[PDB]
Amino acid sequence: FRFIGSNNYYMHYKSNRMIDSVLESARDMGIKVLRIWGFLDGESYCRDKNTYMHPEPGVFGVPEGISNAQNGFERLDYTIAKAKELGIKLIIVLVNNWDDFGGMNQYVRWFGGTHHDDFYRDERIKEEYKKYVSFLINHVNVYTGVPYREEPTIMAWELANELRCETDKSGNTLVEWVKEMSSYIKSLDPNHLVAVGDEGFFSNYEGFKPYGGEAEWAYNGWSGVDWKKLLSIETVDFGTFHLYPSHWGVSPENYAQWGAKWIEDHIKIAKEIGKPVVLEEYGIPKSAPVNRTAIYRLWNDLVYDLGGDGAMFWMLAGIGEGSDRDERGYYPDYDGFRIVNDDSPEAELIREYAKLF
């Protein structure tokens, strides 16, 4: 199974109209897999979206006594049931490295820690993450009757979006945490694939250096991620990597070749370990002084020709509503990476490549 995929982060708190639009757009475009968030941590983040998943330790869903709120499990249930109908598979990520939707720092605040990376080390935090993930994976979808652990529309669980641990540049903290949590998920759900959801950083591997000497930190272990070691974990089924040369220090004239080398290196390493590998987020800003579609074509050709298992752009949006609606009625392009199902050269490229993979 090889595919063109995408990402959408608002499938657990927006309306039926808006969810139907993203999933219908994916089906129309040929996008087979959508990577979505399965978390909403912290009372302030829940209140901001009027949607509750994990507002406090041991509270899953809407707090007793709060009325007029959405339950993010019910919105995720609706998303899964519609994806099932429309033939879209879902990768569902279980916490954010970043503060959007609470993330690791929200868990550290709950447990009175002092650094983001206490999330990997404090046993009280690790226990709360396992309680959350157990609740989610055992949750019975209210539109299908099928618990998520038995739902084939879900392709994979992912431990943590873009996990990093800068406080341990040896890589060992993340290896231990990924071993513990991926084994834990397999103990709950022996059916589904498990992956990490990280960006794919290397930790000073002989003969792997960045294109053009830019963004060395992504090759030399700065983030505390040793991707090869993570991919070798028995309870990890496939490797994930992300690609944003414009965020990482690469010059615009080097975005294409830096990204090309990044894809080549990840596929070579995963092929030697013998597990599948997915480029699960990539993006070039709409305003970059290069042809974004030709970069996306180059990177999709490389994944296709080198035998990578999937290429997933960040990100796909559909129609918008309320305060999230732009000049054409769509959910707005807030970050410069949005693609929608229109006549843009990027949308045309995605439709063309979805026919190939």
Judged by CB, which is closer to ligand BGC: 137, or 163? 163
How far apart are CB 97 and ligand BGC at their closest, in Å? 8
Catalytic residues: 162, 281
From the number of C-beta atoms within 10 Å of its C-beta (0-12, 13-18, 19+), residue 343 rates as exposed
State both tokens at 204: 């000073």
How far apart are CB 350 and ligand BGC at their closest, in Å? 20
Question: For 269, how many CA atoms within 13 A lie in the half-sphere containing its CB?
Answer: 26
Judged by CB, which is closer to ligand BGC: 162, or 265? 162
| Residues in touch with ligand BGC (CB under 6 A) | 98, 162, 244, 247-248
316-328 b/e (C-beta count within 10 Å ≥ 16 → b): bbbbbeeeeeeee
Q: What is the DSSP letter of 177?
A: H
How far is Cα 291 from Cα 348, in angstroms, rounded to an integer? 14
Judged by CB, which is closer to ligand BGC: 17, or 247? 247
Question: For 205, how many CA atoms within 13 A lie in the half-sphere containing its CB?
Answer: 18
Tell me which residue of 72, 82, 74, 81 sits closest to 22, measured CA to CA.
Answer: 82
Judged by CB, which is closer to ligand BGC: 1, or 98? 98
Residues 6+ apart with CB under 8 A from 45: 101, 102, 106
Judged by CB, which is closer to ligand BGC: 89, or 242? 242
Tell me which residue of 105, 131, 230, 92 sits closest to 173, measured CA to CA.
Answer: 230
Judged by CB, which is closer to ligand BGC: 92, or 250? 250
How far apart are CB 102 and ligand BGC at their closest, in Å? 15
Omega of the bond prior to 315 within 30 degrees of 0, cis? yes
How far apart are CB 70 and ligand BGC at their closest, in Å? 25
How far is Cα 177 from Cα 336, in angstroms, rounded to an integer? 33
**Strand order in 3-8's β-sheet?**
193-195, 154-158, 89-93, 33-37, 3-8, 310-313, 277-282, 239-243
Judged by CB, which is closer to ligand BGC: 40, or 225? 225
Residue whose CB is nearest to ligand BGC in the complex, by number: 247
State both tokens at 333: 């392009």
From the number of C-beta atoms within 10 Å of its C-beta (0-12, 13-18, 19+), residue 253 rates as exposed
How far apart are CB 285 and ligand BGC at their closest, in Å? 11
How far is Cα 81 from Cα 218, in angstroms, rounded to an integer? 38
